[PDB]
Amino acid sequence: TTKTQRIASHSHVKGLGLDESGLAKQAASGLVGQENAREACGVIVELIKSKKMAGRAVLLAGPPGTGKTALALAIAQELGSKVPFCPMVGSEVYSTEIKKTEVLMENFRRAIGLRIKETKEVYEGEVTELTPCHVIIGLKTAKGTKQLKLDPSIFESLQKERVEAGDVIYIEANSGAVKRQGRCDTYATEFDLEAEEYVPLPKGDVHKKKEIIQDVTLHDLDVANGEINKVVNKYIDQGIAELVPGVLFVDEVHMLDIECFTYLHRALESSIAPIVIFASNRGNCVIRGTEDITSPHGIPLDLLDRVMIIRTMLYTPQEMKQIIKIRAQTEGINISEEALNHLGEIGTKTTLRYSVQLLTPANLLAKINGKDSIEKEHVEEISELFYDAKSSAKILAD
Amino acid sequence: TTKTQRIASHSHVKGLGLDESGLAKQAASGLVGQENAREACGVIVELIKSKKMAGRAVLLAGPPGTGKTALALAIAQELGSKVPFCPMVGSEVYSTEIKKTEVLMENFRRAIGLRIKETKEVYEGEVTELTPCHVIIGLKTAKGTKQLKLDPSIFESLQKERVEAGDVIYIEANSGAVKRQGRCDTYATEFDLEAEEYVPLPKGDVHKKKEIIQDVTLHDLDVANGEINKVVNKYIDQGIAELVPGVLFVDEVHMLDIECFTYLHRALESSIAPIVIFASNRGNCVIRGTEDITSPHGIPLDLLDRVMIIRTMLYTPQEMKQIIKIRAQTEGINISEEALNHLGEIGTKTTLRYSVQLLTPANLLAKINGKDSIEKEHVEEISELFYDAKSSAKILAD
Amino acid sequence: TTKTQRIASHSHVKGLGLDESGLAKQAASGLVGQENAREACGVIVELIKSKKMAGRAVLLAGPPGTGKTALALAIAQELGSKVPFCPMVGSEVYSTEIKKTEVLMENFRRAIGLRIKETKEVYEGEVTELTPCHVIIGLKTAKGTKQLKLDPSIFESLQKERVEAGDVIYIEANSGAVKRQGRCDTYATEFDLEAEEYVPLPKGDVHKKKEIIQDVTLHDLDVANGEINKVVNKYIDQGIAELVPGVLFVDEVHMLDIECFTYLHRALESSIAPIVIFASNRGNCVIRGTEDITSPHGIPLDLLDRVMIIRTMLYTPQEMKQIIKIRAQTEGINISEEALNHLGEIGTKTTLRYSVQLLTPANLLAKINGKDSIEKEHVEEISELFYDAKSSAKILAD
Amino acid sequence: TTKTQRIASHSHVKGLGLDESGLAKQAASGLVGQENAREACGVIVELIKSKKMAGRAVLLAGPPGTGKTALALAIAQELGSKVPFCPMVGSEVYSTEIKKTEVLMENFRRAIGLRIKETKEVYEGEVTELTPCHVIIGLKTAKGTKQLKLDPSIFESLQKERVEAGDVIYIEANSGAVKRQGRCDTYATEFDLEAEEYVPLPKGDVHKKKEIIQDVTLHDLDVANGEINKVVNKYIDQGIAELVPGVLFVDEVHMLDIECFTYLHRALESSIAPIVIFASNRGNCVIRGTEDITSPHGIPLDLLDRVMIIRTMLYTPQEMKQIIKIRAQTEGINISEEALNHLGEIGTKTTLRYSVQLLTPANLLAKINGKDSIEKEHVEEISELFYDAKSSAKILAD
Ligand SMILES: Nc1ncnc2c1ncn2[C@@H]1O[C@H](COP(=O)(O)OP(=O)(O)O)[C@@H](O)[C@H]1O
Ligand SMILES: Nc1ncnc2c1ncn2[C@@H]1O[C@H](COP(=O)(O)OP(=O)(O)O)[C@@H](O)[C@H]1O
Ligand SMILES: Nc1ncnc2c1ncn2[C@@H]1O[C@H](COP(=O)(O)OP(=O)(O)O)[C@@H](O)[C@H]1O
Numbered sequence A, B, C, D: 001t002t003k004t005q006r007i008a009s010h011s012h013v014k015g016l017g018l019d020e021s022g023l024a025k026q027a028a029s030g031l032v033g034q035e036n037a038r039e040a041c042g043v044i045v046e047l048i049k050s051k052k053m054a055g056r057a058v059l060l061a062g063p064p065g066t067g068k069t070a071l072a073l074a075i076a077q078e079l080g081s082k083v084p085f086c087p088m089v090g091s092e093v094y095s096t097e098i099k100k101t102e103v104l105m106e107n108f109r110r111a112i113g114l115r116i117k118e119t120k121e122v123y124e125g126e127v128t129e130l131t132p133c134h135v136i137i138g139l140k141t142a143k144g145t146k147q148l149k150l151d152p153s154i155f156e157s158l159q160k161e162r163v164e165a166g167d168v169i170y171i172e173a174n175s176g177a178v179k180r181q182g183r184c185d186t187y188a189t190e191f192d193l194e195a196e197e198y199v200p201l202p203k204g205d206v207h208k209k210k211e212i213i214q215d216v217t218l219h220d221l222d223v224a225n226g227e228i229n230k231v232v233n234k235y236i237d238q239g240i241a242e243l244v245p246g247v248l249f250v251d252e253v254h255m256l257d258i259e260c261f262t263y264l265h266r267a268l269e270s271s272i273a274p275i276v277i278f279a280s281n282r283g284n285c286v287i288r289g290t291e292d293i294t295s296p297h298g299i300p301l302d303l304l305d306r307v308m309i310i311r312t313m314l315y316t317p318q319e320m321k322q323i324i325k326i327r328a329q330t331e332g333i334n335i336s337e338e339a340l341n342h343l344g345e346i347g348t349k350t351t352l353r354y355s356v357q358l359l360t361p362a363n364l365l366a367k368i369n370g371k372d373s374i375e376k377e378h379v380e381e382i383s384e385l386f387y388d389a390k391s392s393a394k395i396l397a398d
């Protein structure tokens, strides 16, 4: 929840938007501007894919709201929309009921993926009918159509998968899980490519054994069950399961202490390890736990020695506006150009994240005046009603 | 007790007093002035009601006695006079016999409401008579009148509910609890609207099964009984119980440390979570537990990023007088206009809370001179007899 | 892993490259420049070999990237490519699940070698054939050729040892371990010296008892098994095993505290002890654990009294280029002279380790533009894409 | 080991070298210069011998390498070459597996001697022959010669005692320990005094009971075995054992904390206690454990009140040369006068201990150039190759 929540403001980020030369496109994969850093992340992506990252980590350094989290996430997108991305903040290690290296370990395990191939008993086909009498469904394969009667329980799941008549689905016989594959090929046009949104009519019987591929994390297995690692290694050896190290993003790196960096240095050498990407908005800091050793970003030298550092720069109000616009678009929030330009300007006086967070309040304030679009007047009101943290701390200082 | 005590100086606060446009009325729902902040809280109220507050919290920032606690409480009033409001101060986490995240957890559970529908055996009707012989009572429904004989125990409860002959009540057969519904409809005039202060004659028998609706908190269930959460979830699924997240108000936010903020960030993402409203009267502070990281209001950035910040401003002596007046009125304390004007002036030299606390001492000092109203002379004496903390610390400094 | 990883950037270091007079050669054994220090390490090497190091330790002092780790490793090379070298950093003692003197102890035991003579049942000879039917192998000795059939398990090991037809190998009958001795003498030319890359045809039978000599560390025995020390001493007394104290390199010496130095002082007097070599890039420091005692490099006087101190100096960009070149050559990375000269210059503005770490990213960036050699343009791009820690901390400071 | 190691650089120190008047001789008992302090230690020696030291301790104060450790050791020599001398440094109390007052206690017990008279079964005499056939030995007393056949075990011990034919020895029948008494009287000349290097032919039989006198410490009994103290007191009462309190030397006195000084003050009043001699190279220091109480040498007043303080002064390069010469002579290291004069000069720029430690490296560097004597050129090279701690910390500071 905190993590899905954490990644929601980045729902538009699909990758780094580079061309084949590895250079940044004007605007692609959701990203605009920040081109130098995007290109540096692309080198990281190639290094990771080449397995030339052994014992290295990444550090994104720059001010608040300069896309450090977006860029980390984009790296994981470029390895695959499948690849696990686990964002944390360093202060999360300080907790009253769990040791700090158990927090780190847990976050490591969230960042290591496993693709498991299993054969399951299913009922599958094109959904020829949905008739609540319980719900009757007809499923069609190349061999013909068969009727099922579904309990409310499986019907709810089918409704959750947004299954409609015309879709190809399967229903796992044991768990009752419903998977929507796409729309059946029968109904595709000449605009619709092969097996994408539209998929073939399944061959064979409605009721059959089907080879399914689950993407799970090593943490997702903990909750569903040391003993784990043993089974996982069995499965890889049998080519039943395949490891997929992901990305561990550690914002607020300076909140880590010496014991945390000792644990991290060691862990990131594991062959199955995720790539570790740190983020910092600070310069030189006393390394926490030492009391007097000052170091770039609060990271010990022997670690910094293995860290590839990419700088992120402040956006102009013009760049910020382009990004605020992607967020509004992605959110389904209608907003005038003048309103967006004002939000850009507010962002430059505060941060990008502050401007972005004003969209939802401005939108509701628009709805309340019977308007279905944010206008400049609503941005103006909202920004007089609410304060950024720097402005508020300053007023109260003075 | 400490919490009812905590909310007593806000007994006049009924809501935020905004119009349908969401703009502040001159004086409504007990609030006067502080209009910008009241309007910002109204946006929060709509966001909460729309469920657009996921992963956000609120921060009220301003000096002492600028209505931060009043405004938080007003938000809970606007969600419902039913909705749980739990005020705490951050230093309450530091306690010798309970861990700091057990304090926070307990305060979370006080801030989550549960409406439970139950059917109980009752005796109900209009109270046709009260005759202490034990006490004889006649209860009347549409089917007729029946006599009961009450033990002192239930009579005491009935007396506590301020039940008079003419009122419609019920008496729970098992617990012996007495509920006063209102005055019977039979005696209402043409000024008295339907089922308000005045309620219908109940239909059916005096003795019957009645569907009652209890508002409890998750903390109120702890005391009357992990195992709880299980039963509660059962009841929601059965539509027997309904959750009502309330408001958790955390004043003195800078007294929280890093472990507290890690626990809070996580907790406030729970789907059943109350809205968290922080309050601060400070500017930049070392985040407690870090020793060197300075931050607006002593809150870590990753939290501040999710916090909507509303500023509260100092009242003029004129505004303060309006508020001191509401408090006197609400208290039943008679006071001259000149006395109120003096209290306004004292408030500007000290704080609003200091002026407000002088009413009760001034009133007693009035009674002692045979006066049934506070006059300027009594405010003058009281303010020479007692000191505000700033004045006292200064005298002793010097 | 962290340790093999730790020694990888020094894979070119074969010794100290001194002549018989003990003076530094222009460039030999992988080292270039740093001649004074290399000559001082050569005195240490002779002292150790003479056993005149009793109760002394070594300190390498100089800035980051001046070869302190290389020189320590080179000392161990000069005692033997066999001699254990264990590099650590002082902050590694601070760990959440292991005491600080258990870290030190473990690192001591990694730095003490044991040569064990054992007689094992083997199959050996020249590999006359490799035929996967399982894999058939013919092994030839002076007495003739014998066929074996190997399971996939031993075949994998043989493949790991890079065994080819024509090589002399042995296969341990019990463990199944494969050892490649070299190419058979039969196929050597007049350029190929006796028993080096090329080794004799083994005498006797394919199947025989063979005296093998394993080099292990005292830590390598822990993992494969107090009780250990007892057995080890038995074996030395029987001339079955022979001790070989190695080198313990402790970088970041100032991260050690007083309890660590008390433990180290004592341990390094053990007769079986490794030589301890410290490294420092700092001047006077508060001795950690004391709060107020300042001392050269953060080391207590009574220790400093027993420490032989060798200074390492900054390389010019010209020297740095020579070293960057050895690393590229050793890596198999093609790079123009102009590109190397630029990396030298970058190294002088940053450190040698930063320049060296740019090779792999520059190389991949070269491959991506279809180039099989790094050119100046790729060094330029790479250095604009990535930042050194000093530059990044400075930008964010300002 | 650490302690024998600790006393090795003082192997030339035989006493304080004073005349009968108690005044310092130019050069005697290994000491040169430092005359005032030597004379003050001589008063201490007489006070101790008179038992007028009850509740007093000694403090040697002066810079590094001014002979504080030498002088402490010399005091113990003057009480007897037998008398236990236990040197420690105050930071040794801070250890992870032993409490700080258990370190102190252990060091107290090392500093208390016990002379035990025992009668043992022995074989003794003049060694008339050594014939390895096992080894045959003939032992001769006044009653005649007897042959023994020794196992390798006792022969090794005899070889360790440097026993030659012509020496008078005994061999303990039970333990197998070999003691070399000296050369037999039969072979002495008129230059050789009675019972010194040369001792009489033993009277009686080869095999006999012999009264032997072992010098042990109370710590030496711990390792070979509270219960101890009981037995020891038994033996003193029986005149079987005799106590000999020694000297406990505590360098780095300012590393002791308040709990250590409380334990020490108390312990040094024991009747069996060693004399405690502290050493300091510092002026006023915060007493460790107090945070704010400043005191000469970091010692509490009530202790300082009982401490007799002797100052040690810096040596000139001329005095230092005399001392460097004694060390070379004692070591068997040949060195020119010019080389010694250079070492004196180096010592004045650094410390005496630094110059002294350059002898062994300079000597090896001499051997390497085929020279059997250190010449100025070798001192020059060695001092350019290695650095003193002050010089190294300074370079790296700057
Ligand atoms: N170059 C960019 N293109 C598109 N979106 C961006 C870009 N940079 C930042 N963002 C977005 O702007 C918001 C703030 O960026 P974020 O990654 O949180 O910054 P940081 O982590 O540096 O504080 C996020 O919603 C993020 O997705
Ligand atoms: N705008 C307002 N209208 C009515 N009452 C107010 C207003 N602001 C503050 N109060 C009341 O004044 C007193 C002080 O305000 P409070 O909410 O405690 O201030 P704070 O929490 O900022 O110190 C309380 O009794 C409160 O109910
Ligand atoms: N004189 C030298 N000759 C060859 N390689 C060197 C030399 N000095 C340093 N190196 C190499 O340069 C890199 C940096 O040196 P390193 O030993 O890590 O420096 P330090 O430990 O002082 O920071 C390593 O790859 C090392 O092998």
Ligand SMILES: Nc1ncnc2c1ncn2[C@@H]1O[C@H](COP(=O)(O)OP(=O)(O)O)[C@@H](O)[C@H]1O
Pocket: D009, D010, D011, D013, D030, D031, D032, D033, D034, D062, D063, D064, D065, D066, D067, D068, D069, D070, D071, D323, D326, D327, D352, D353, D356
């Ligand atoms: N006056 C002296 N005569 C002979 N040797 C001395 C004299 N002073 C010091 N030494 C010797 O010089 C070296 C340094 O002296 P040491 O006792 O360790 O000094 P400190 O303990 O004050 O640092 C030792 O080898 C010691 O035996």
